[PDB]
Amino acid sequence: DAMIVIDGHGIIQLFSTAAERLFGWSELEAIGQNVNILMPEPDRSRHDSYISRYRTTSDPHIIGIGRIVTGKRRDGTTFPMHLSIGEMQSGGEPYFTGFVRDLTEHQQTQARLQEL
Numbered sequence: 001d002a003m004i005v006i007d008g009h010g011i012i013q014l015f016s017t018a019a020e021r022l023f024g025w026s027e028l029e030a031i032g033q034n035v036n037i038l039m040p041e042p043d044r045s046r047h048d049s050y051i052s053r054y055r056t057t058s059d060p061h062i063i064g065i066g067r068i069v070t071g072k073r074r075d076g077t078t079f080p081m082h083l084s085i086g087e088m089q090s091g092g093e094p095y096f097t098g099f100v101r102d103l104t105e106h107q108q109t110q111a112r113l114q115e116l
């Protein structure tokens with residue numbers, strides 16, 4: 001699906017091919033950018049606090065729990081996507097791997113069936 005790996009500060013570490021197609025950023029452009037560039041406000045400005053809250057409390061909220069959210073493409077367009085993150089440790093520091101399943105087609109099919 002699309003895959004993104006970030007470090008404990010929300011910085012993109014790895015960014016898969018399918019992620020590039022989905023979000024519109026190339027791997028080099030994406031890497032080193034904060035994961036919040038992938039979501040609209042008000043979430044964008046808060047994401048760091050979310051990662052910060054968890055880091056500090058050690059109390060999971062959305063770890064291993066998939067939820068539907070609104071993502072943002074490079075061109076400004078937004079779209080619903082299913083997201084699940086796994087926590088992993090490497091080199092002593094924590095990393096988070098997210099799997100994204102695009103849901104636009106589902107949202108359109110559902111909107112359309114409702115309209116008809």
Ligand code: HEM
Nearest residue numbers: 004006038039043050051054060061062063069071096098
């Ligand atoms: C691109 C669309 C995304 C949106 C809209 C989004 C939104 C959110 C929200 C609302 C929260 C906190 C929810 C709560 O308090 O229960 C959160 C937490 C978090 N997100 Fe995201 N996120 C996005 C993508 C990502 C990705 C791709 C990663 C991992 C590579 C990620 C990593 C995290 C982490 C580490 C937390 C903290 C977990 C916790 O507090 O339990 N997010 N996100």
